[PDB]
Amino acid sequence: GAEAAAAAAVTAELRAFRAAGGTVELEDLPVTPETLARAEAALARLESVAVETYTVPAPTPEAFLAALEAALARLAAEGLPAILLRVVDADGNLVGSILVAAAGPPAESAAATGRVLTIYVASSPEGLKVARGLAIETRDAGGLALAIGASGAWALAGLAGALALARRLAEAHGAPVRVVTIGDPANPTDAALAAAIRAAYAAALE
Amino acid sequence: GAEAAAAAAVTAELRAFRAAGGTVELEDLPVTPETLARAEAALARLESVAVETYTVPAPTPEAFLAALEAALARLAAEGLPAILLRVVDADGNLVGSILVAAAGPPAESAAATGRVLTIYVASSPEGLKVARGLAIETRDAGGLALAIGASGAWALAGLAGALALARRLAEAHGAPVRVVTIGDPANPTDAALAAAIRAAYAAALE
């Protein structure tokens, strides 16, 4: 089904990133008092963030890659530190959000910090608060980061498009990409997402 | 098969810990220059560690719980900061290792640090170096920690017995347990273990 196809896209993008010469570092972090406090401290440093809405009728890696490229182009044109994307389906219903946070040109952040991109992923609003705040923390450390809030096939297709963006930005220079799934410890949806991402990663390494 | 039964034990112990009043915090960390350096710094602070060998003919949560209790009793009797267990099958072949690191009585570490136990799990020798070093780091911060090195059903049964130990030590006082799976980013065995633990955790939350 759609979730299986989106997971296969994640596996294919993980394999492709490694074949191009970079390591994928996968981390899973719980929402805890320590991670919540870090996220809140970073969010306090940045409602001030611009929003735009993109229409993605179906969950595909190619569509998320193109939306992320559009968001980076807008950040460059406006000189902004971050942009919040609302992602909607063909009926206009929201199927995800992506906060994109840049510290400068992406080629330069990759070289200065030694990481091409940090991709945070969450499904629940509680995980997403932490994912968004940690993306801002990464930006304030000098790196390019994004935080995807979505579920099921949309979350996986978003992750696959973000890995494709990381691969394109790396240009075979060998910098790693870090993927961080954030989950509220009690939320089975967050747990299901983490399990699906880990399974897709296991399949990429076989 | 054995792996499925061991995973079901993990799921049952996760459910039981939560029903007793504590949160399970699950983290997955990659081996990276940062985590390797932290692990090496802690290992340098502690070949000096005592070894004992326990015979566990089959991968069961009850047997790992009892072995861990025996290890804690030995630490108390000898006044030692850590003990390395070799775990062997009925033919004497090694099926895992567990480094157990205590900062004092386990009831007191749970109260002082706000965490009852930190359980690190790895399959590959590279993940296990980091798991062992991070267990020592936890001990030096005042907490009780253990690092399991094993694969398949043995790793999962070890994790299930460690969760049972955490539940017993918590005595319903509500402190969380932290489980940390450590993987070398390229190693499919480490990835397979992380995927199996995440799936068992998703099943516990449903």
A199 close contact with B: CB closer than 8 A: yes
Cβ atoms < 10 Å from Cβ of A100? 27
- Residue A173, SS3? coil
Computed from CA positions of residues B179, B185, B187, B188, in that sequence, does the dihedral angle turn out positive or negative?
A: positive
The 3-class secondary structure across chain B, one letter per residue, is CHHHHHHHHHHHHHHHHHHCCCCEEEEEEECCHHHHHHHHHHHHHCCCCEEEEEECCCCCHHHHHHHHHHHHHHHHHHCCCEEEEEEECCCCCEEEEEEEECCCCHHHHHHHHCCCEEEEEECCHHHHHHHHHHHHHHHHCCCCEEEEECCHHHHHHHHHHHHHHHHHHHCCCCCCEEEEEEECCCCHHHHHHHHHHHHHHHHHHC
Experimental method: X-ray
Angle between helices B152-170 and B2-19 (to 10 degrees): 20
- The distance of Cα A63 from the centroid of its chain, to the nearest Å, equals 14
Q: Do B197 and B121 meet the contact criterion of CB atoms below 8 Å apart?
A: yes
CA distance B53 to chain A (A): 32
- Report the alpha-carbon distance of residue A157 to residue A72 in Å, rounded: 18
**Tokens matching residue B35:** 């985590």
A4 close contact with B: CB closer than 8 A: no
Cβ contacts (< 8 Å) between B206 and chain A: which residues? 188
**Tokens matching residue B43:** 């290992």
Cβ atoms < 10 Å from Cβ of A26? 25
Asked if A194 lies within 8 A of B191 by C-beta distance, the reply is no
| Partners of A183 in beta bridges | A30
Cβ contacts (< 8 Å) between A201 and chain B: which residues? 191, 194-195
- Among chain B residues, the shortest Cα distance to A204 is held by B188
- Residue A79, SS3? coil
- Report the alpha-carbon distance of residue A8 to residue A71 in Å, rounded: 25
The owner of tokens 């980013």 is B185
- Report the alpha-carbon distance of residue A81 to residue A135 in Å, rounded: 11
Buried b (16+ CB within 10 A) or exposed e, B21-54: ebbbbbbbbbbbeebeebbeebbeebeebeeeeb
Asked if B26 lies within 8 A of A28 by C-beta distance, the reply is yes
- Report the alpha-carbon distance of residue B74 to residue A146 in Å, rounded: 48
- Residue A206, SS3? coil
Resolution (A): 1.4
Computed from CA positions of residues B166, B167, B173, B175, in that sequence, does the dihedral angle turn out positive or negative?
A: positive
Sequence letter at residue B161: G
Picking from B187, B65, B178, the residue whose alpha carbon sits closest to that of residue A24 is B187
**Tokens matching residue B129:** 């170096």
Asked if A186 lies within 8 A of B202 by C-beta distance, the reply is no
Q: For residue A170, what are the CA distances in angstroms to A18, A85, A115, B54?
A: 11, 23, 9, 49
Picking from B1, B24, B3, B16, the residue whose alpha carbon sits closest to that of residue B123 is B3
- Report the alpha-carbon distance of residue B84 to residue B204 in Å, rounded: 30
A206 close contact with B: CB closer than 8 A: yes
Q: What share of chain A is helix, strand, coil (3-state, %, to 5)?
A: 55, 20, 25
- Residue A118, SS3? strand
- Among chain B residues, the shortest Cα distance to A200 is held by B195
The owner of tokens 């949309």 is A154
- Report the alpha-carbon distance of residue B2 to residue B58 in Å, rounded: 9
User: Which residue among B24, B176, B192 places its CB closest to the CB of A202?
Assistant: B192
User: Which residue among A185, A186, A195 places its CB closest to the CB of B195?
Assistant: A195
Contacts of B188 (CB under 8 A, 6+ apart): A202, A205, A206
Say if strands B94-101 and B82-88 run parallel, antiparallel, or are unpaired. Answer: antiparallel
- Among chain B residues, the shortest Cα distance to A23 is held by B185
CA distance B9 to chain A (A): 17
- Report the alpha-carbon distance of residue B106 to residue A150 in Å, rounded: 40
User: Which residue among A30, A195, A206 places its CB closest to the CB of B202?
Assistant: A195
Asked if B198 lies within 8 A of A201 by C-beta distance, the reply is no
What's the DSSP call for residue A123?
S
| Partners of A24 in beta bridges | A177
- Among chain A residues, the shortest Cα distance to B200 is held by A195
- Report the alpha-carbon distance of residue A145 to residue A116 in Å, rounded: 9
- Report the alpha-carbon distance of residue A100 to residue A83 in Å, rounded: 5
Asked if B185 lies within 8 A of A24 by C-beta distance, the reply is yes
Asked if B194 lies within 8 A of A192 by C-beta distance, the reply is no
Picking from B194, B41, B159, the residue whose alpha carbon sits closest to that of residue A201 is B194
| Partners of A83 in beta bridges | A50, A100
**Tokens matching residue A104:** 């400068």
Asked if A205 lies within 8 A of B188 by C-beta distance, the reply is yes
Cβ contacts (< 8 Å) between B14 and chain A: which residues? none
Please give the sequence-ordered ranges of beta strands (E in DSSP) within A31-143, or none if there are none.
50-55, 82-88, 94-101, 117-122
What's the DSSP call for residue A12?
H
Select from A28, A34, A123, A206 the residue whose CB has the most chain B CBs within 10 Å, as the one to mutate to test that interface. Answer: A28
Asked if B185 lies within 8 A of A25 by C-beta distance, the reply is yes
Give contacts of B 157-196 with A, CB under 8 A.
176, 185-188, 191-192, 194-195
Q: Do B28 and B117 meet the contact criterion of CB atoms below 8 Å apart?
A: no
Cβ contacts (< 8 Å) between B114 and chain A: which residues? none
